[PDB]
Amino acid sequence: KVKLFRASEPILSVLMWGVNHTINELSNVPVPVMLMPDDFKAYSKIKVDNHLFNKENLPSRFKFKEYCPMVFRNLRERFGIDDQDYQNSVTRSAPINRFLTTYDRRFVIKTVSSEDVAEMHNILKKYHQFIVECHGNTLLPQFLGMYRLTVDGVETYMVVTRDVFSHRLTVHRKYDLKVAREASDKEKAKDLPTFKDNDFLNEGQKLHVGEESKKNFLEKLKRDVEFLAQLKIMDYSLLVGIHDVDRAEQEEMEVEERGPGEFDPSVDVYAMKSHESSPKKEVYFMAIIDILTVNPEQYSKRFNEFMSNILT
Amino acid sequence: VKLFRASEPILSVLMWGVNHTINELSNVPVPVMLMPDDFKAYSKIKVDNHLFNKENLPSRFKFKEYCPMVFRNLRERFGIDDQDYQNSVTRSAPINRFLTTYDRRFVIKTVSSEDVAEMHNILKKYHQFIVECHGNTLLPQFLGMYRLTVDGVETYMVVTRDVFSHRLTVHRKYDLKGSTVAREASDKEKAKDLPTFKDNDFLNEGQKLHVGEESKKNFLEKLKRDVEFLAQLKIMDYSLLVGIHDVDRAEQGPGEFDPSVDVYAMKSHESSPEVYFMAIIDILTPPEQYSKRFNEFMSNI
Numbered sequence: 358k359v360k361l362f363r364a365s366e367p368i369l370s371v372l373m374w375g376v377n378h379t380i381n382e383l384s385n386v387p388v389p390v391m392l393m394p395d396d397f398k399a400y401s402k403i404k405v406d407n408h409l410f411n412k413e414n415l416p417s418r419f420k421f422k423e424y425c426p427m428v429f430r431n432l433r434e435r436f437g438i439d440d441q442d443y444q445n446s447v448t449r450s451a452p453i454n455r456f457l458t459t460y461d462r463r464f465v466i467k468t469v470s471s472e473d474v475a476e477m478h479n480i481l482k483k484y485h486q487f488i489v490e491c492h493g494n495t496l497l498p499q500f501l502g503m504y505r506l507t508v509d510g511v512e513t514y515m516v517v518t519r520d521v522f523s524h525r526l527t528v529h530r531k532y533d534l535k536v537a538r539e540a541s542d543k544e545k546a547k548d549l550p551t552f553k554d555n556d557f558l559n560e561g562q563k564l565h566v567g568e569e570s571k572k573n574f575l576e577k578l579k580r581d582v583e584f585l586a587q588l589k590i591m592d593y594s595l596l597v598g599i600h601d602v603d604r605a606e607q608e609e610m611e612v613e614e615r616g617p618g619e620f621d622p623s624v625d626v627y628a629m630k631s632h633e634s635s636p637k638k639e640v641y642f643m644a645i646i647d648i649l650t651v652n653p654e655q656y657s658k659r660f661n662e663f664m665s666n667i668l669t
Numbered sequence: 670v671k672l673f674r675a676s677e678p679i680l681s682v683l684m685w686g687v688n689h690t691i692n693e694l695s696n697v698p699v700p701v702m703l704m705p706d707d708f709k710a711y712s713k714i715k716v717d718n719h720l721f722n723k724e725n726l727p728s729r730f731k732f733k734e735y736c737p738m739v740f741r742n743l744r745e746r747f748g749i750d751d752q753d754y755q756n757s758v759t760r761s762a763p764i765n766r767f768l769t770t771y772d773r774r775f776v777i778k779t780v781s782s783e784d785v786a787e788m789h790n791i792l793k794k795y796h797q798f799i800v801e802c803h804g805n806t807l808l809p810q811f812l813g814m815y816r817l818t819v820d821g822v823e824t825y826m827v828v829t830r831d832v833f834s835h836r837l838t839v840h841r842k843y844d845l846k847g848s849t850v851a852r853e854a855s856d857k858e859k860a861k862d863l864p865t866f867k868d869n870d871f872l873n874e875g876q877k878l879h880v881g882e883e884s885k886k887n888f889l890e891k892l893k894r895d896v897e898f899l900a901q902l903k904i905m906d907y908s909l910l911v912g913i914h915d916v917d918r919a920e921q922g923p924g925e926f927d928p929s930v931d932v933y934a935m936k937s938h939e940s941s942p943e944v945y946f947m948a949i950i951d952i953l954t955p956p957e958q959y960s961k962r963f964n965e966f967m968s969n970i
């Protein structure tokens with residue numbers, strides 16, 4: 358039953374320890390009827406300074422700060438994430454990959470800059486109200502916690518979201534969509550390339566979701582970009598991922614020698630099946646990302662029209 | 670949900686800290702042996718949170734546990750499960766600075782730093798003695814030691830197994846020394862509800878003349894081992910605390926107790942008019958002179 362907090366790096370061990378600690382601490386903190394404004398200004402800091410004790414996996418000295426833990430706890434609730442689920446993805450085994458995901462591919466941990474944290478703060482109340490109003494039906498990143506680790510005297514900022522891709526359905530092509538932007542010829546020769554806009558126009562792929570999925574999605578995307586424009590935020594993106602079900606079968610067969618295209622929308626929340634009339638049987642994952650940074654209203658309109666183009 | 674609701678804020682931190690350290694420990698494997706560094710180790714944490722969980726806890730405080738591996742092993746060697754210990758400390762605020770846990774099972778005493786340094790000086794030989802006697806001993810049973818810091822004021826504590834029962838109320842109390850010096854109960858101390866009478870007050874009574882047959886011998890052998898060890902460790906000024914329970918007074922099961930829980934407890938011999946509790950106390954202050962005098966006095970009664 359023992360959490361060893363064994364990782365490859367001490368920052369991952371402290372990360373796992375700190376999530377375990379905060380989730381447990383928070384569990385002794387009652388759930389409030391409503392958030393008060395202090396919850397948006399609060400934090401929890403703890404400093405561990407041990408001696409000749411529990412050195413095997415943790416550093417002997419470190420610090421863990423969790424931002425606005427009441428807000429992020431409520432957000433976890435608003436997103437249908439059980440905190441004990443959350444901690445166990447983080448702590449049952451060391452996350453992997455600064456970009457990290459939890460061992461079970463269910464959550465993403467991105468290290469961020471202090472300015473990112475401050476931006477997160479300036480927006481958090483409007484974000485929480487948006488999350489209330491759209492019941493969590495959104496394409497924006499879904500924030501579950503924000504943390505400052507301190508280890509070796511280096512402070513480290515990290516923000517947790519839901520991974521936009523499925524934890525079960527493997528992703529076969531990736532795109533990051535937002536002037537002419539192309540993926541590096543070096544990146545174009547990587548294993549899973551994060552292909553860009555120009556590469557998509559030259560490939561001319563198109564996602565086939567069928568009117569009903571199309572409509573759900575476009576309505577939430579219009580609301581989201583209007584909301585972002587409202588906070589004067591730019592440089593965000595739409596991450597899109599393709600899972601070709603036939604290939605998933607083939608690769609599972611290769612595995613064998615040495616449901617399919619079914620997924621849980623409760624769990625894989627950005628995911629959509631292809632229209633029943635589709636050429637290839639495919640599953641798509643689509644979300645807005647990178648929301649922590651020539652007009653925001655102009656960019657709103659440009660982004661929205663482009664993303665409106667990519668569907669059927 | 671543990672609120673850590675207490676009578677005083679330091680009690681809230683005490684409950685928080687025992688809870689925290691024990692949970693932390695549950696994730697530390699139990700080692701084939703204690704190593705020397707465990708007797709020199711400690712765990713310190715500083716909590717400084719802001720607009721958060723302030724309702725019953727302080728926003729800033731610190732908690733140090735001394736030699737937690739050794740003390741965990743002592744809890745085990747004394748047959749205390751950490752989760753029982755944790756629940757006694759944390760399920761409800763302790764009570765009465767001298768404390769017992771809400772359930773009267775464990776004793777929490779504030780101590781001085783000098784006492785703490787003495788404790789460290791003795792811990793290895795003490796632990797080894799507790800090993801050798803399988804825990805069959807009359808000495809105090811140390812279960813944990815901690816330094817609280819709150820508003821910047823540090824506070825030391827040592828937790829032991831309580832001598833009195835968590836169920837049966839105690840009807841007379843005495844604190845015995847055996848000095849050649851004369852120690853009597855204060856007319857002011859005699860003016861408390863449960864007087865801690867000394868030797869002189871105990872000599873004049875017939876229910877105070879205790880009665881026991883075969884158990885007396887093995888009890889005396891264990892008292893001898895303890896006092897010989899203390900004389901050996903250069904400890905003086907220690908005491909024997911004792912309690913009497915007249916079951917008739919309780920009526921006005923009865924006289925039933927679990928010896929697995931109330932370990933210092935003894936039934937009266939059939940040649941009796943009661944149930945008695947007896948242990949050694951005050952042992953953190955550094956002759957064999959005192960050892961022999963003390964042991965001889967306790968040998969007769």
Ligand SMILES: O=c1[nH]c(=O)c2ncn([C@@H]3O[C@H](COP(=O)(O)OP(=O)(O)OP(=O)(O)O)[C@@H](O)[C@H]3O)c2[nH]1
Binds near residue numbers: 399475
């Ligand atoms: O708009 C905000 N509302 C807030 O409520 C808030 N709380 C923290 N921050 C940001 O925190 C980051 C560095 O960490 P921080 O300065 O908070 O650490 P700190 O206070 O312990 O000091 P030090 O340990 O680095 O010496 C910086 O981006 C601070 O602007 C906030 N920004």
Ligand SMILES: O=c1[nH]c(=O)c2ncn([C@@H]3O[C@H](COP(=O)(O)OP(=O)(O)O)[C@@H](O)[C@H]3O)c2[nH]1
Binds near residue numbers: 533647
């Ligand atoms: O929620 C998510 N689940 C994921 O699985 C995932 N995978 C990538 N991303 C984002 O894509 C960009 C990195 O692309 P990159 O080119 O590999 O890195 P960089 O741009 O620094 O060179 C950044 O926005 C990453 O946060 C993901 N977000």
